Amino acid sequence: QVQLQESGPGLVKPSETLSVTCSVSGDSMNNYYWTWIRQSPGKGLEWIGYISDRESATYNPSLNSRVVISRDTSKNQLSLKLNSVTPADTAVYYCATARRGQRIYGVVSFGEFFYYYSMDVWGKGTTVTVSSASTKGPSVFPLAPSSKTAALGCLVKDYFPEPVTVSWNSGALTSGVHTFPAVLQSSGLYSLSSVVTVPSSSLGTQTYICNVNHKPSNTKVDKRVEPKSC
Amino acid sequence: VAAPSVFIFPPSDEQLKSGTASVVCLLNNFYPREAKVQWKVDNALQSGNSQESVTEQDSKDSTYSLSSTLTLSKADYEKHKVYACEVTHQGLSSPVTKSFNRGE
Amino acid sequence: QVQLVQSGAVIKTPGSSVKISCRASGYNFRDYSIHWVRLIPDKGFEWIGWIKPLWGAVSYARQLQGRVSMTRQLSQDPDDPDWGVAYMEFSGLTPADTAEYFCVRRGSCDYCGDFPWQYWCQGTVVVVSSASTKGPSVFPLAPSSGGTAALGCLVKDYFPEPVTVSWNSGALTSGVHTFPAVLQSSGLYSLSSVVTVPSSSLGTQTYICNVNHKPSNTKVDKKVEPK
Amino acid sequence: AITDGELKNCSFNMTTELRDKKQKVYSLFYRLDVVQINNKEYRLINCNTSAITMVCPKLSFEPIPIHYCAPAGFAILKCKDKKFNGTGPCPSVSTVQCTHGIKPVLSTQLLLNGSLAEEEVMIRSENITNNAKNILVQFNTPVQINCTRPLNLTRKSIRIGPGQAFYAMGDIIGDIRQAHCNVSKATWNETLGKVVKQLRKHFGNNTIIRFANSSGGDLEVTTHSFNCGGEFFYCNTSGLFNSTWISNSNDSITLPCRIKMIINMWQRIGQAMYAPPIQGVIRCVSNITGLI
Amino acid sequence: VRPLSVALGETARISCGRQALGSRAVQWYQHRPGQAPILLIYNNQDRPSGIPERFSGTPDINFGTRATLTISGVEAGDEADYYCHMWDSRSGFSWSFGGATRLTVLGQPKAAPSVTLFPPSSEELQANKATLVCLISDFYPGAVTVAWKADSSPVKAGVETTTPSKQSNNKYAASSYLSLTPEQWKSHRSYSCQVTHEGSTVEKTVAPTEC
Ligand SMILES: *[C@@H]1O[C@H](CO)[C@@H](O[C@@H]2O[C@H](CO)[C@@H](O[C@@H]3O[C@H](CO[C@H]4O[C@H](CO[C@H]5O[C@H](CO)[C@@H](O)[C@H](O)[C@@H]5O)[C@@H](O)[C@H](O)[C@@H]4O)[C@@H](O)[C@H](O[C@H]4O[C@H](CO)[C@@H](O)[C@H](O)[C@@H]4O[C@H]4O[C@H](CO)[C@@H](O)[C@H](O)[C@@H]4O[C@H]4O[C@H](CO)[C@@H](O)[C@H](O)[C@@H]4O)[C@@H]3O)[C@H](O)[C@H]2NC(C)=O)[C@H](O)[C@H]1NC(C)=O
Ligand SMILES: *[C@@H]1O[C@H](CO)[C@@H](O[C@@H]2O[C@H](CO)[C@@H](O[C@@H]3O[C@H](CO)[C@@H](O)[C@H](O[C@H]4O[C@H](CO)[C@@H](O)[C@H](O)[C@@H]4O)[C@@H]3O)[C@H](O)[C@H]2NC(C)=O)[C@H](O)[C@H]1NC(C)=O
Ligand SMILES: *[C@@H]1O[C@H](CO)[C@@H](O[C@@H]2O[C@H](CO)[C@@H](O[C@@H]3O[C@H](CO)[C@@H](O)[C@H](O)[C@@H]3O)[C@H](O)[C@H]2NC(C)=O)[C@H](O)[C@H]1NC(C)=O
Ligand SMILES: *[C@@H]1O[C@H](CO)[C@@H](O[C@@H]2O[C@H](CO)[C@@H](O)[C@H](O)[C@H]2NC(C)=O)[C@H](O)[C@H]1NC(C)=O
Ligand SMILES: *[C@@H]1O[C@H](CO)[C@@H](O[C@@H]2O[C@H](CO)[C@@H](O)[C@H](O)[C@H]2NC(C)=O)[C@H](O)[C@H]1NC(C)=O
Ligand SMILES: *[C@@H]1O[C@H](CO)[C@@H](O[C@@H]2O[C@H](CO)[C@@H](O)[C@H](O)[C@H]2NC(C)=O)[C@H](O)[C@H]1NC(C)=O
Ligand SMILES: *[C@@H]1O[C@H](CO)[C@@H](O[C@@H]2O[C@H](CO)[C@@H](O)[C@H](O)[C@H]2NC(C)=O)[C@H](O)[C@H]1NC(C)=O
Ligand SMILES: *[C@@H]1O[C@H](CO)[C@@H](O[C@@H]2O[C@H](CO)[C@@H](O)[C@H](O)[C@H]2NC(C)=O)[C@H](O)[C@H]1NC(C)=O
Ligand SMILES: *[C@@H]1O[C@H](CO)[C@@H](O[C@@H]2O[C@H](CO)[C@@H](O)[C@H](O)[C@H]2NC(C)=O)[C@H](O)[C@H]1NC(C)=O
Ligand SMILES: *[C@@H]1O[C@H](CO)[C@@H](O[C@@H]2O[C@H](CO)[C@@H](O)[C@H](O)[C@H]2NC(C)=O)[C@H](O)[C@H]1NC(C)=O
Ligand SMILES: *[C@@H]1O[C@H](CO)[C@@H](O[C@@H]2O[C@H](CO)[C@@H](O)[C@H](O)[C@H]2NC(C)=O)[C@H](O)[C@H]1NC(C)=O
Ligand SMILES: *[C@@H]1O[C@H](CO)[C@@H](O)[C@H](O)[C@H]1NC(C)=O
Ligand SMILES: *[C@@H]1O[C@H](CO)[C@@H](O)[C@H](O)[C@H]1NC(C)=O
Ligand SMILES: *[C@@H]1O[C@H](CO)[C@@H](O)[C@H](O)[C@H]1NC(C)=O
Ligand SMILES: *[C@@H]1O[C@H](CO)[C@@H](O)[C@H](O)[C@H]1NC(C)=O
């Protein structure tokens, strides 16, 4: 019913206003109370704060006053803005909605209850890190097939900020498409290696382009796999 | 009065692989509680190797069971062939036996 | 209400000694005598002793001299006089002392004696056995192939009791017979458990004997079929 | 997090067995029974003038029917006229040895577990046109009430001296809830349909009869006092006495209710009592037979 | 954060660890690594759509019995972290999750390896690099070694891996990149990919003329 996509730049510089925007469809956003949760790597989860429908602004008293939520009802776009960001703000950001409940334990209209929330739509997550480094365009080289099924592959050398998205046939090939972790280089970079299973009776026929996307460096790539006699 | 349906459970290899097997006479669904249930090993009376237990009178049928055992060593069961019990009641006009010849 | 809470179930080895407590409430504990009686499984009752509170004066049987001893604990509260705790220590245990012990009070009276026993505690069983805790195995029982026939299993050589045995987990309950625990073969019990089914279904279904010896966390499942 | 607190959690010194050693003890006093001296430091409500005598724990205060009897040479006469407003001749008299058993209950503004009338509501006063005289009302049918203290409590056993202890509140095992009482609404609105009906024979048919609530005072006279279950409830009754009358199912009225445990009954100079806490929740059921 | 371990099929029991006071409203999640959390139990008892019926909280508890999660029978894809989210009446507004227990199941099969082979890609052999890549998977357990010999001689230079990590099919994986160059290829007649699991070794060989 409600579909949630996360957006956000892969690298930002320290001491800078962070911005994570939540793409929302369905337009049923004015029946819910919106929030953000995050997981700094190596820890459990932690909430961030609540925005209501009437805009009642609360936030966690484990962060300082440097947190602000805005919500748009026109473009239907939620915003998260961590001000004066540090490397302590290295985490994975989930946009979420929650309903209300109340557990009555006594006489109503004496105030003998309390509220409890729960989350119902889970988003897709955006990963953001903080460093003084700059974004580096990749060096993409498609890997040729072998003679058996068959081993279609791709290499994205020299990429940071990580992760890497690699698809096939301009996105249209989803059968047998899988990637593994991009292996950490000693130079502070990363090298993705792809693996895709295609039959060899077909792999030498169609137009297998290694399709990559890269938002943080602002580059799109389409390079053709060439056949070889392995 | 009533009559119990006599059984004889053969000595399985499941317990003779441990060295002591169980020849189990087994009476069910009778009254009165008293009974004279005897047994024989190769048509010969034994003793001192049995533990017999009765049960209590049921709340639905008001009847009784009985289960005796004949626990011997593994040399003693394969030595003999003809295994049988004996059942004797006020409500039976004839002694009833059932048999299980060993190896046959 | 005149309550007499006795604790508790004990398993010991021969040569040892046990202390059994008996908490009373609902009456003035400093006023009424407390008998101790023992209920042998094959000899009937046997009077152990007799304790009188407010001073602790005791008397015993004469066949239990030199072994038994009992005392009490008086509540000292000016705003709660109605409870109290009795004790009993029964030393020199042997396996022939296994029975169920009771802690028995009389009732209010005008024209009677001391021994008529009105309020009864629940009792506790003191087992004296040199056997150690051991799990049960399981062994199937069936005929080779109209008339009804006994399927069943044999649950042999366990310690201590009780084994709870269910059938096909566990809805097969009709036609199900259990025997009390067969006595000590070198210190270990066994249970017979047979189920009568018509002899057509022997060649059709697979039957399960679910042994649950809880004090040793043993669980076994034998299939029973016409072999 | 404060919504509207009731209890307070305290700390003080207390002697051990040997009366030269001092230890820290706590308790849970209500806020009515604690006043301020000047973190922060508090004390009890009456350390100036009164010696607060702890009511013994072996005691029990409870309504039990007392029969008033006359010794030899004396007799008691009982009226049986059903229209007896309280004065003048009673044409039906019978001698009695001992009166019926009245249950001594000490309450204000409402008469609990009383004796009923016979046919109709009986309004009864001394000099009706005089303001300073109270107006006694007596019902022919009882009006039921249900009262509770819905929070659970235990007792500490902080000793004082050799053989003399002291009981206090220890823990809230559960959840904090306000003590309250229910009166049904459809029975209360019909029971006022009778008190208005026979007030108008004393004042006039075409008059308007209204009920207000109070105009001031202490807790003993602005509210409804009990003595039930061993505790002392002071319920706010501004929801019952509130309506007008103009001469033409299951919804209960809830009444909020306070609790205090240092009471001074009859207001004697320098004297005060103390009720020890009751272990467990308290439940009460009573009838209302009459008003003042 | 906290481990937990049962056999496959064995009933898992997760106590929370929040000494709840008063009246409560517990919530349990499935946080399956690689994905986002999933609301399992709602308001002590509600299992919404998309949650399988093998998961159930405690609807029948009175006041004072500890809430515990009961998974009836565990499937391979059920290794995850199980947070107990517990609000109370004698506490403030509750923003601390509290853990949690990781149901790591035992009795899972089975290590059955394979190596996928990848060429020296002729588009960047002119840029003096080699795309000799092995891509390894299909394990249980997944703590696995990758190795690269120069025909008998172990080399470690130019090699960069990660730690092992799971796939989507509940088996593990291991991947590796090699920074070899056409100066380092032609010095030896061949290199060979080696994968070991539990003492057993897979051997695959490559060459510039036989990839
Ligand atoms: C003076 O008069 C006053 C008013 O006349 C009285 O004030 C009343 O005081 C009581 C307390 O004594 C209050 O009760 C509480 O109300 C909660 C709110 O109720 C909501 O939901 C109701 C559901 O209706 C069903 O259930 C009720 C009772 O179960 C039943 O009467 C009704 O016909 C129907 O079957 C709905 O009707 C209401 O309008 C509200 O929407 C109520 O939920 C509370 O019960 C909770 O809490 C207690 C303690 O925690 C539990 O023991 C209960 O079982 C129940 O908890 C259940 O739900 C929880 C989820 O919220 C779960 O966590 C629990 O595990 C449990 O779940 C089981 O039971 C459910 C019932 O079947 C199932 O659905 C579940 O699946 C599980 O099986 C609590 O009782 C009154 O609200 C209050 N009235 C007013 C108007 O304020 C006052 O008492 C009087 N004083 C005197 C002295 O007489
Ligand atoms: C108006 O009249 C009604 C009708 O009698 C009256 O209600 C009565 O209140 C008393 C309060 O003492 C009730 O007595 C209690 O009843 C409960 C029921 O479970 C018992 O548990 C109690 O037993 C305890 O008593 C002591 C309390 O500490 C302990 O010493 C003892 O060991 C027990 O624990 C006790 O019997 C009585 O039952 C009701 N009556 C009815 C019919 O329910 C009401 O109090 C009167 N109104 C006023 C303001 O007094
Ligand atoms: C309670 O009931 C009694 C009797 O039922 C009431 O007493 C009655 O009071 C009236 C007051 O007006 C008396 O009437 C007056 O009588 C005198 C002579 O006695 C006369 O001079 C006056 O003009 C007037 O008629 C009446 O006599 C008296 N009843 C009897 C039997 O003497 C009393 O008023 C009632 N109380 C209330 C508060 O209503
Ligand atoms: C404990 O609760 C009391 C009761 O609400 C609080 O009392 C306040 O005291 C201040 C002191 O002058 C008053 O100005 C307020 O009007 C009182 N009430 C409220 C609701 O604030 C007290 O603040 C509480 N204790 C602490 C340490 O905050
Ligand atoms: C009232 O205050 C006392 C202490 O002033 C509290 O008792 C403490 O409870 C904690 C539980 O988290 C224990 O660790 C401490 O050891 C206790 N202190 C003492 C001296 O026993 C008590 O919990 C408070 N009561 C309420 C209802 O808040
Ligand atoms: C004991 O009495 C004194 C005198 O009334 C109380 O102290 C305060 O004194 C000033 C000036 O005398 C009065 O204006 C205040 O009204 C008094 N406060 C109160 C609360 O009465 C003192 O508080 C009293 N102590 C106790 C325990 O009641
Ligand atoms: C009030 O609290 C007491 C505990 O202080 C509760 O008594 C317990 O009740 C449970 C459930 O029956 C028992 O398992 C415990 O043994 C009891 N404790 C004691 C010390 O007796 C009591 O039930 C509570 N009352 C209410 C109405 O909830
Ligand atoms: C006061 O409490 C009593 C229970 O002690 C209530 O009596 C019950 O009322 C309901 C509704 O009419 C009936 O279903 C029950 O059968 C009644 N109980 C008994 C024992 O008869 C009574 O309704 C309450 N009164 C008020 C005014 O709330
Ligand atoms: C009932 O009595 C209460 C107090 O006993 C009266 O409450 C006051 O109401 C006025 C509004 O007219 C408020 O300004 C005061 O603050 C209230 N007093 C208190 C102590 O809070 C009330 O007027 C009376 N009447 C009704 C119909 O409720
Ligand atoms: C008794 O209860 C009435 C209400 O039932 C109380 O009146 C309330 O007083 C507060 C104080 O300002 C107001 O905020 C509420 O709006 C009033 N309620 C209504 C309905 O008007 C009254 O104050 C209570 N008595 C005492 C002494 O507090
Ligand atoms: C409180 O009122 C009730 C209601 O009258 C009394 O309970 C009995 O209720 C029945 C109704 O079926 C009447 O017929 C009885 O006459 C009532 N009394 C008795 C003794 O059974 C209840 O008794 C009243 N409380 C007291 C203390 O008298
Ligand atoms: C003791 O003897 C008296 C004599 O009258 C008799 O009444 C009483 O029953 C006897 N007591 C017992 C316990 O037999
Ligand atoms: C009670 O009933 C009367 C008559 O039906 C009605 O006029 C009045 O509004 C009701 N309520 C109160 C509070 O008097
Ligand atoms: C008031 O009403 C009563 C009702 O019967 C009647 O007897 C009386 O005469 C009336 N009084 C006036 C002044 O109307
Ligand atoms: C008093 O009466 C008014 C008018 O009927 C009503 O609105 C108000 O709620 C009453 N007060 C209380 C405390 O119920």
Residue numbers in the entry:
A (entry chain D): 1 to 82, 82A, 82B, 82C, 83 to 100, 100A, 100B, 100C, ...
B (entry chain R): 110 to 213
C (entry chain O): 1 to 52, 52A, 53 to 76, 76A, 76B, 76C, 76D, 76E, ...
D (entry chain A): 142, 149 to 188, 191 to 309, 312 to 323, 323A, 324 to 398, 405 to 406, 412 to 453
E (entry chain E): 5 to 7, 11 to 66, 66A, 66B, 66C, 67 to 95, 95A, 95B, ...
Task: Give sentences copied directly from the paper behind this entry.
In the pre-fusion, closed state, typical of SOSIP trimers, the gp120 domains surround a bundle of three gp41 helices, protecting conserved fusion elements of the trimer. In this study we combined structural and mechanistic information to construct a mutant Env that is no longer responsive to triggering by the CD4 receptor.
Since the F14 mutations were primarily in the layer 1 and 2 regions and were predicted to block the transition after CD4-induced destabilization of V1/V2 and V3, we combined F14 and Vt8 (F14/Vt8) in order to minimize V3 exposure. The Vt8 mutations consisted of the V1/V2 mutation Q203M, V3 mutations N300L, N302L, and T320M, and the outer-domain mutation Q422M. The BG505 F14/Vt8 SOSIP construct displayed a ~4-fold enhanced CD4 affinity compared to BG505 SOSIP with a KD of 15.6 nM ± 0.4 nM primarily as a result of an enhanced association rate (N = 2 with standard error). Importantly, the combined F14/Vt8 construct eliminated CD4-induced exposure of both epitopes. To understand the structural basis for the observed lack of CD4-induced conformational rearrangements, we determined structures of the F14 SOSIP trimer in complex with VRC01 and the F14/Vt8 SOSIP trimer in complex with VRC03 and 10-1074 via single particle cryo-electron microscopy (cryo-EM). However, map densities in the C-terminal portion of HR-1 in both F14 and F14/Vt8 trimers displayed a helical extension of the buried three helix bundle toward the trimer apex, a feature that resembles the extension observed in open and partially open SOSIP structures. As a result of this gp41 restructuring, residue K567 displaced W571 from the layer-1/layer-2 pocket that was formed by residues F43, C54, W69, T71, A73, C74, D107, L111, and T217. Interestingly, unlike previous stabilization strategies that either reduce or prevent CD4 binding, the F14/Vt8 trimer retained interaction with CD4 while still preventing CD4-induced exposure of open state epitopes.
